Amino acid sequence: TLSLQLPWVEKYRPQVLSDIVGNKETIDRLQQIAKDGNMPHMIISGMPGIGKTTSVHCLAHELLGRSYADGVLELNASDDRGIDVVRNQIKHFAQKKLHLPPGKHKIVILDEADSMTAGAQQALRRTMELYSNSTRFAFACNQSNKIIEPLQSRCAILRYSKLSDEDVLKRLLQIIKLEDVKYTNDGLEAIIFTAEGDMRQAINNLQSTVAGHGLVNADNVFKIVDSPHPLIVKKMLLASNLEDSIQILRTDLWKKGYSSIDIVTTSFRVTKNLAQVKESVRLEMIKEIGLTHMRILEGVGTYLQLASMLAKIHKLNNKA
Amino acid sequence: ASMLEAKFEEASLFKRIIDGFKDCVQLVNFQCKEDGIIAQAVDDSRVLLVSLEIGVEAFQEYRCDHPVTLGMDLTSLSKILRCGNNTDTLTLIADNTPDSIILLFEDTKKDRIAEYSLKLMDIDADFLKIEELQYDSTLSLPSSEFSKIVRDLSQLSDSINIMITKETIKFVADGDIGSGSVIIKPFVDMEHPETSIKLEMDQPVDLTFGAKYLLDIIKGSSLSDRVGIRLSSEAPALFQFDLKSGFLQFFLAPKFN
Amino acid sequence: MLEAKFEEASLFKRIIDGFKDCVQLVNFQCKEDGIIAQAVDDSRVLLVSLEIGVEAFQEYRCDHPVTLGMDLTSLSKILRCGNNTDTLTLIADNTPDSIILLFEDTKKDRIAEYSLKLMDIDADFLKIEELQYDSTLSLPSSEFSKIVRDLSQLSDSINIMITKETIKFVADGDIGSGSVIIKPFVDMEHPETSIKLEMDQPVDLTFGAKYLLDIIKGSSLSDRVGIRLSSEAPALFQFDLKSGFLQFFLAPKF
Amino acid sequence: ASMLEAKFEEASLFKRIIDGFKDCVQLVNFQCKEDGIIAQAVDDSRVLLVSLEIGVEAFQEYRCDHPVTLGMDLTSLSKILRCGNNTDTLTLIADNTPDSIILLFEDTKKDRIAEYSLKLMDIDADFLKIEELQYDSTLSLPSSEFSKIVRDLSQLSDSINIMITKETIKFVADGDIGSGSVIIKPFVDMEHPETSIKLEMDQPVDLTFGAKYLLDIIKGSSLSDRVGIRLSSEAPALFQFDLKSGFLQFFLAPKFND
Amino acid sequence: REEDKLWTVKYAPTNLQQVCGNKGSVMKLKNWLANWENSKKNSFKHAGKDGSGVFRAAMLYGPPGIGKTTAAHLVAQELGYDILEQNASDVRSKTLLNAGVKNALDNMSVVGYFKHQNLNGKHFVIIMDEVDGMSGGDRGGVGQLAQFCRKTSTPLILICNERNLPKMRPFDRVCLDIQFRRPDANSIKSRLMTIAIREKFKLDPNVIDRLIQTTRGDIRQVINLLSTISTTTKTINHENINEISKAWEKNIALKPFDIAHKMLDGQIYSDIGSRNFTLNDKIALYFDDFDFTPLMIQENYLSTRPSVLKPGQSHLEAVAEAANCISLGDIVEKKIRSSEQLWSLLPLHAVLSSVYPASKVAGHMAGRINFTAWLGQNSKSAKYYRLLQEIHYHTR
DNA sequence: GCAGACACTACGAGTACATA
DNA sequence: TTTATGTACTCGTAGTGTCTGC
Ligand SMILES: Nc1ncnc2c1ncn2[C@@H]1O[C@H](COP(=O)(O)OP(=O)(O)OP(O)(O)=S)[C@@H](O)[C@H]1O
Ligand SMILES: Nc1ncnc2c1ncn2[C@@H]1O[C@H](COP(=O)(O)OP(=O)(O)OP(O)(O)=S)[C@@H](O)[C@H]1O
Ligand SMILES: [Mg+2]
Ligand SMILES: [Mg+2]
Secondary structure, three states: OOOOOOOHHHHOOOOOOOOOOOOHHHHHHHHHHHHHOOOOOEEEEOOOOOOOHHHHHHHHHHHOOOOHHHHEEEEOOOOOOOHHHHHHHHHHHHHEOOOOOOOOOEEEEEEOHHHOOHHHHHHHHHHHHHOOOOEEEEEEEOOOOOOOHHHHHHOEEEEOOOOOHHHHHHHHHHHHHHOOOEEOHHHHHHHHHHHOOOHHHHHHHHHHHHHHOOEEOHHHHHHHOOOOHHHHHHHHHHOOOHHHHHHHHHHHHHOOOOOHHHHHHHHHHHHHHOOOOOHHHHHHHHHHHHHHHHHHHHOOOOHHHHHHHHHHHHHHHOOO | OOOEOOEOOOHHHHHHHHHHOOOOOOEEEEEEOOOEEEEEEEOOOOOEEEEEEEEOOOOOEOOEOOOEEEEEEHHHHHHHHOOOOOOOEEEEEEOOOOOEEEEEEEOOOOOEEEEEEEEOEOOOOOOOOOOOOOOOEEEEEEHHHHHHHHHHHHOOOOEEEOOEOOOOEEEEEEOOOOEEEEEEOOEOOOOOHHHOEEEEEOOOOOOOEEOHHHHHHHOOOOOOOEEEEEEEOOEEEEEEEEOOOEEEEEEEOOEOO | OEEEEOOOOHHHHHHHHHOOOOOOEEEEEEEOOEEEEEEEOOOOOEEEEEEEEOOOOOEOOEOOOEEEEEEHHHHHHHHHHOOOOEEEEEEEOOOOOEEEEEEEEOOOOOEEEOEEEOOOOOOOOOOOOOOOOOEEEEEEHHHHHHHHHHHHHHOOEEEEEEEOOEEEEEEEOOOEEEEEEEOOOOOOOOOOOOOEEEEOOOEEEEEEHHHHHHHHHHHHOOOEEEEEEOOOOOEEEEEEOOOOEEEEEEOOOO | OOOEEEEEOOOHHHHHHHHHOOOOOOEEEEEEOOOEEEEEEEOOOOOEEEEEEEEOOOEEEEEEOOOEEEEEEHHHHHHHHOOOOOOOEEEEEEOOOOOEEEEEEEOOOOOOOEEEEEEOEOOOOOOOOOOOOOOOEEEEEEHHHHHHHHHHHHOOOOEEEEEEEOOEEEEEOOOOOEOOEEEEOOEOOOOOHHHOEEOOEOOOEEEEEEHHHHHHHHHHHHOOOEEEEEEEOOEEEEEEEEOOOOEEEEEEOOOOOO | OOOOOOHHHHOOOOOHHHOOOOHHHHHHHHHHHHOHHHHHHOOOOOOOOOOOOOOOEEEEEOOOOOOHHHHHHHHHHHOOOEEEEEOOOOOOOHHHHHOOOOHHHOEOOOHHHHOOOOOOOOOEEEEEOOHHHOOOOOOOOHHHHHHHHHOOOOOEEEEEOOOOOOOOHHHOOOOEOOEOOOOOHHHHHHHHHHHHHHOOOEEOOOHHHHHHHHHOOOHHHHHHHHHHHHHHOOEEOOOOHHHHHHHOOOOOOOOHHHHHHHHOOOOOOOHHHHHHOOHHHHHHHHHHOOOOHHHHHHHOOOOEOOOOOOOOOOHHHHHHHHHHHHHHHHHHHHHHOOOOOOHHHHHHHHHHHHHHHHOOOOOOEOOOOOOOOHHHHHHHHHHHHHHHHHHHHHHO
8 A cells, every 4th residue: 555645735734823824914913912922712713724723723832832732622523522521621621730831821722613512602601701811712613603692702703704816826836836846827827716715725726736737737727626516507597598508507517417406506506696686586596496496306306407497597587 | 759748558548538528529629738638628509618637647658848739620539549459559749839740559569550640720719717616416426327327318308307305316307208207325335336326415406407418428438437426506517537547527507497 | 007017128128129110109908918909000901919918927907998099119219218127117097198117126226217198099990800821830030030031132022832841932033033941840959949830721922021021020029930821811920928929910912 | 963063161151252342343254164163353443353263172062064154243142142041051053054043052950941043144244364473562461450451541541552661561541631651560470370471572662552442352351361462563453362272362453643 | 910811800890880881780689689688587478669579589681791790799799698600511400400509599508607797698699690501491400490489598690691582481470580781882981991091002982882882782892802902903093993893793693573674674675785785694684593584574574664666566566476485485394394304495495485575575664573473373273273173082 | 258339331312403 | 382304412311230348
């Protein structure tokens, strides 16, 4: 069995708060907390892959360089995050006597706290209210709606935002300077367009393209990763001249092996997030796509159901 | 070669002492001074005050450099204390400003050594200055007999109405299912004095106690053959178990009258 | 007007331990000749009847028959309080809404008196159907308990078949099958452990595993259990006591 | 005549072997040949392997004409084994192309022969032979002592680090609530040779193991009074429990270190 | 050791006049707790104008971060009582509550002996925080707490968030009903002026209104917000107030009345409203209370004066159009809650039951939002059914 | 040696959520 | 009093097995 090279996702994982590129105000605030020391309870939320847990880990490393292995607790959904284990472990950690530097506090990191049970969060509320001058919590969830209201009340909400293409380009050029590779600007633009703000997706696509071909060119990138289905579905829905939408479907979704359920769900999401057309036409289109979704889920999954959904959408578009 | 080298000569004694009040309280502060080890704990319901004191004579070699607070969880201490043998000699060790303590379980055979580190929990508990007062009655009976009687009565009601009148202890209990009563007579046993009942009468008493609290108190009945209970009308009961060089006295507050 | 002073509370303790789970509410229709009781489970398929004569009691005096509707969990707690060397004294009044269980020890060190109220439970219909049973066997209770437990591990329906002096407890399930046969062994040095059978006519009866496991809890009463079966009448598992006996009536379930 | 006829003296034996690895393994198979009833199975998590061999010496009378494979569910088999007494004698009976075995519980003290049948199963796991023969450290210590050590160190943490030095065996079990360090040195007890501990150190060994699987290993300490651990880097640990005719050797994969 | 604690604990109310806002609730609570002795000697029968005599226990409810816990603790400490605080971190099921503070309800403290003039130092006050955290329901401790309220010999104080849970029903009137509200801007303004003086950071007197209204009166998050802002930039003015507001909006899950009130507004469905309040926002608004929103839309989808009528379309035609989609979404709800349990149709149910029907009848309202009446009539219909099968069994 | 006393895994029953 | 399977969690429960000491 051959050995495996470390993936570029964590082979170039940042270790300093200056390495991560993104929301400049957020990173400056994190650096200020790093220099000062008095870290408040924070709830970091945002889209996947935009550098949430890496910032928390870098901040904890900078704050507890010498006592990271002793005064930092890391829990996630992979651990038994239930009321008994949360109670016992968090209360044992929050009362443990560890002589940190005067500005440094214990940090309890809870990755992906969105999937955490309500009673465990209720216990965490009381634990945070008791032990706050010795330990400081730190959540990192994709959506902050799952976390109960009192936990957000006693924390400091800090939301991330999707990275602009400039920051993804800067990081990609930094990694390309770190490891030698031949690239074309068209290939990098294609990778950035495919990533859609997801830095981890960009790194995975770049690594896959380099391993598959060795040259980061537009054709190689489009061979490794296909065009995203939301874009082709949006092109299908927005286009008039029903025959054109029918052939777009039959060419780019049916013969490319996309399941009918996936096409219908993607159409629902696209027409929900669509902004070019007015509200009433979006509502009708959602109604028709939902009727087709009901038909598909009942079991009648064929090309003709999708064609009929497109036909009803186009009859709506031409205003009968 | 550290601050504290308190060395028990027989570890199961310390295991019994810790298990004596394991369930009632979890966090306990251990004050370690030159005279001995004194510990005070407060129950979560603030009704039980488990005062403890171990003299220097109990330890085979007790050497405390200067007074210090040792706050440790009883759950972790009981988990660690299940790692030794009857011949094992506990050699509790603490360093300067301790964050962890080494419970070195030595053995008579020198090829078997087991050291366990225990992380100290920061506990904020105000010290209670108890005072010596005369109680209306002092009852001393064997711990096994007392435990038997109280476990008999606790299977009937959640409350016990201890009564001492006319040199007649009147352990009674009334509940929804029924009513129970036990009457004992103080006497002296020539064959085995530790099986006798001794009582002194100063004032009558009217005291009431719960069930689970008394069960937690008698959980530590293994340390002493006989328990010394002192009753006062307007003062907490003092359930005292005499050790070889110390005691484990419980302060349980009687209910409303 | 009831004074039933036992010589050892362990008898009453193992009796109630025998019928903890088969029934929860029981009406004690105590009489002069002793105490008899009849009880039916919630499923209306298991019938338990107990009988203890005066010969077991050190003292007994019941002038007026009184039907006592009494809880078994409270008795279990009160008799777990009791232990050896203590003589239980069942005491009742003329109109005993509350019962008294005096625990008298040899020494005056600690004598305990207890109480328990009497709930309203309707008097069960005293069916006295005693139809003759085709086959009769009696084997040690430990052997029967082991056999029924091991065969109930495999399946939930134990078949009992008697033919040619060879009882064949067969239970067939999903993990496999189980067949045990018993020859009519006779023992001289230890007559208590023996297998004797009176096969008048062969029978083939199937019973559920839950009730067959439940009836085992009376094994502490007797070292031997007598079982008599009929093709249509309910089976009779009888536990011998010093004075009387305790019996289980379970109808066949084909 | 049944082609497979294996007789057990002191039928509590086979129950002890079955209980040795009932908890860790749920599905086994028994390649019964003329040499003896061997077995080999891998857990669902593909971490711990259980090899087994029972020689012809352990059987009163053993006769196996052709190689037989008996894929089995260990839970049902252990339940069947529990359906008997140690006084009784157990017999495995299987015919040609078996669908199930026949287990007999006979005793001359009282004629109460009980015949149980357990359905077979098609595991279809060909596995492979053991290809590990060289080990750095080869140590044997009493089973009771090792089981006790594992038991009181599994409560502290989930990882038990076994370290081997020059005539020094160290178990480190650092965890959340504290740490642990059991140091045991070789010594030869002349009075009780069964309580002696032996060490044979070639190259230093530093391996960590999971607590739950090590508890599953020590669950077999009732099978034999002594266990011989044979550690080596880049090689699974070999916990071998000797039998009267064969052995019950386990293979445990050390956890990764990074 | 100072300058490491949170700003929400070092700047905490020490005495009763430092609790900014809700003065009436605090003084009512203190009056109730100060007159429980004579009420106890009155056998909870005679009460004054306020009714504190007949209320054996008092419970506290309101939005977070307004001072329920702090005011309760200060009142308990000031009057010499010994605090006994409980929480959801300690399990409070039937067993652990019957073997918990059940004994302490009719028992007096032991620490009050050695801490002593104080006349109530040998008593307990039961401060049960996080009682909404106990989601046990049946046999979950709520019935045990009802029994405790029925029979306790010590003051009992409960702290929760809001009362509209069906779990919270058994405390309808057995407990006192003191309620806290959002504190006024003047008291918070004075408190934050003191905070700004203490922490030497610039705080304009006019940005504070926006800081409060973004956080919805949650004082603790306000103090945390000023702390984290002043970490890197201690001066705030009109320049950064919009960025601070958009970055630290509270984003409360809306109340079942509030989802309907926001969804029936005609402003959000206009061309400007659609851009500011997108369709995804409406879907999230439905999914805030996806259980009660489809009904709550339906009971009052016709009691609104329309403002989004198409030219030539009457109000009754719009109501019929909305009713057609309510009927259509009924089928989707049935298919979701069926044997198959196709729960991927919930976003469909959003549009088919709340978005589209409210998109035709939007505008200003004829009256206040009417609660779902389908629940009560469904209960009455079920009782009528049970009666009919009962008389059908009896008549045969 | 036997009966308890413990901690232990295991089973049963009930609440809660289910798309971003 | 509603949805109506499957999943996950939480609890108290009853057996089950192991260690102490009469
Ligand atoms: N601002 C950034 N600068 C540099 N690398 C980044 C940045 N954001 C993300 N990355 C890269 O993304 C990877 C780390 O992503 P994560 O932070 O683990 O994703 P995440 O934020 O945790 O989102 P989820 O919810 O866990 S999927 C590493 O390969 C990083 O190099
Ligand atoms: N009236 C007030 N004036 C100023 N600060 C206040 C006030 N009320 C609360 N606080 C702050 O909030 C902190 C704690 O408030 P709490 O009363 O514990 O919150 P809460 O009402 O219990 O809400 P929960 O428990 O999180 S749902 C105090 O230490 C203060 O910093
Ligand atoms: Mg993450
Ligand atoms: Mg609160």
